[PDB]
Structures are given as structure tokens and as C-alpha cells.
């Protein structure tokens, strides 16, 4: 990465896992409504 964006290095190492969280988020919302 460019040295100007070395700030968000810990943030970059997290971003790829975010889509998987959407799969898990669907179960939270479903558990919240009690699996109607």
C-alpha cells in the first residue's frame, strides 16, 4: 500500500471477512423474529 494509506492497514486486514458476517447477520435477524 501507498504510505499515505498505511493508517488503515489494520482496517484492510478486516474488510475481506465482512461478507461472511452478512450470512451470520441473516440468522440474527431470523432469531430476532423467532424464525417465522
Amino acid at each position: 500500500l501507498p504510505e499515505a494509506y498505511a493508517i488503515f492497514d489494520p482496517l484492510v486486514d478486516v474488510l475481506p471477512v465482512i461478507p461472511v458476517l452478512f450470512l451470520a447477520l441473516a440468522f440474527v435477524w431470523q432469531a430476532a423474529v423467532g424464525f417465522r
Binding site: 489494520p10 482496517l11 478486516v14 452478512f22 451470520a24 447477520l25 440474527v28 430476532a32
Partner: peptide, 29 residues
């Protein structure tokens, strides 16, 4: 070094927080 762990903290809780907010507000869940 654990800035590591701070990112996944706010990002990871960002999901369920919306569900919690929509619950206490009794939104269209």
C-alpha cells in the same frame, strides 16, 4: 497490533446493533 482487534470489534458489532436498535424501536423486523 490490537488495532487489529478494535476494527473487528466495531465492525462485528455494527451488524447486531442495527437489529438491537430496530428491536427497541420496534421497527419493521
Amino acid at each position: 497490533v490490537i488495532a487489529q482487534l478494535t476494527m473487528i470489534a466495531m465492525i462485528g458489532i455494527a451488524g447486531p446493533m442495527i437489529i438491537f436498535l430496530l428491536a427497541v424501536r420496534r421497527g419493521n423486523l
